Design an enzyme around this catalytic site. Sequence first.
Site, PDB file in Angstrom:
ATOM      1  N   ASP A  71       2.631  34.226  22.984  1.00  0.00           N
ATOM      2  CA  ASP A  71       2.619  35.538  23.860  1.00  0.00           C
ATOM      3  C   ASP A  71       3.644  36.319  23.380  1.00  0.00           C
ATOM      4  OD1 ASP A  71       3.071  32.709  25.504  1.00  0.00           O
ATOM      5  OD2 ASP A  71       1.427  33.957  26.156  1.00  0.00           O
TER       6      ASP A  71
ATOM      7  N   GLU B  99      -0.766  37.182  20.892  1.00  0.00           N
ATOM      8  CA  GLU B  99      -1.187  37.909  22.138  1.00  0.00           C
ATOM      9  C   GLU B  99      -0.463  39.294  21.656  1.00  0.00           C
ATOM     10  OE1 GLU B  99       1.644  38.759  25.167  1.00  0.00           O
ATOM     11  OE2 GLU B  99      -0.254  40.198  24.785  1.00  0.00           O
TER      12      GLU B  99
ATOM     13  N   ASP C 269      -2.822  36.254  34.018  1.00  0.00           N
ATOM     14  CA  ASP C 269      -1.927  37.295  34.413  1.00  0.00           C
ATOM     15  C   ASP C 269      -2.667  38.234  35.221  1.00  0.00           C
ATOM     16  OD1 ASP C 269       0.503  36.098  33.581  1.00  0.00           O
ATOM     17  OD2 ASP C 269       0.470  37.323  31.764  1.00  0.00           O
TER      18      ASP C 269
END
EC number: 2.4.1.25
Length: 499
Positions: free
Chosen positions: A293, A340, A394
């Site tokens: 991420d 990401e 998310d």
Amino acid sequence: MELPRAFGLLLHPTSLPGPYGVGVLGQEARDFLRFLKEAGGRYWQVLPLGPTGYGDSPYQSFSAFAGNPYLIDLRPLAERGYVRLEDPGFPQGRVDYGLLYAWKWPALKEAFRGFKEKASPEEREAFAAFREREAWWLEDYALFMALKGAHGGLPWNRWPLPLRKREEKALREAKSALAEEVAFHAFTQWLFFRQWGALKAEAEALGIRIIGDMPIFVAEDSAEVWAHPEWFHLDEEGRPTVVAGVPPDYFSETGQRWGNPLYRWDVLEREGFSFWIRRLEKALELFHLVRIDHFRGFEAYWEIPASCPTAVEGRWVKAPGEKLFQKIQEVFGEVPVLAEDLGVITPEVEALRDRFGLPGMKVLQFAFDXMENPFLPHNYPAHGRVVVYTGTHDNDTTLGWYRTATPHEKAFMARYLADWGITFREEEEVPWALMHLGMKSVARLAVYPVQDVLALGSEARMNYPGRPSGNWAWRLLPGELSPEHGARLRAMAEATERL
């Protein structure tokens, strides 16, 4: 790495069905793998698997190495006679974390006392062998957790100085006094990795690859930070002087203030980056690929001053991502890492991502608010080295997102779908329509959340960034993910050269 034309599904193990309040690493985990395989999927994506604290967030873990004791299947323990299992009445389709905390922790402590009482000597030795092998992280983690029980649940940077400052004596003392509690914590890890291990072999035999998730910044209140304060920007009290996040945005007036402690990159570099090497080695023990991420943070990060309540104030600071990755490639010989790369991406981030062959991501829910949009399939890389999602953990579920989508997004979405021969009749068909678009695209890998497969509304949303409560709680119902859902995914994959 090599990314063949395929599809997969995103499903955090806590969302699995079954008894005792939360998804575990047992039969239902295997049942889901069987379902995936029969549907033609070759990938199972999960979120970080560590122990959670306040908020129940996988992204705010007590340790970068430990596994979540909530994921432990208690059933094998009951069979061996270590514990008697009484279900206190868990709700359906959701994790009641309060009840899980009140019930699962004691049940685990029970199973440990019962294990000490009846386990055969070979079981005790293997356990002890595990402790010896994992010692370079485990000793700190297990002591960390035991120290919470000796100190009202306080974060490490709030414990008495001798314990906070890690003096040799205080430590050795605490370890002696908390011998039993320290061992209980290590026993949760022994069980976790052996259980995850068995699950990883099941996926392997079934030809399924597991994509793991590694956050760039680790949690403030965590064992590794407590054990290496010099690696982070902390004051003498052990509190972050600056915290992580992202600056004001198109999608966020104030931005997001994560709160994570920030690395002293220069100090990690002189030290040799052992933290990163260790994290990657470990991730590769649990997963075939790993998604990192906030990948852009390897190039530059937003430094928010601790005394600021938002993300508005701050400065960009360069990070030696180029050096770290050259070291990783030199030492591992391959980065089976997905990046990401959402949010604002500069040409420096793209160069670094591409320099190392890392596939990035595409999110369809973000593709329609404006033909030049990079999230539209016709703008994907010619060779398709990317991962396309309808939405991640998310975002809202696709149906949920669609119900609140602006009139211009819906109209363009429908016109774009038609250009690809995809049409729909009702809004409930929108998840499948977008999944079809993703499967028809050049993206080597299409990965979809299970909620979109079931076409669920906002109630099934996994994380709503900004909300402090109600997240990470969605769970499948027994038999909700049906054989028909599988055959439907199979046909879509067959029809799009994904099998």
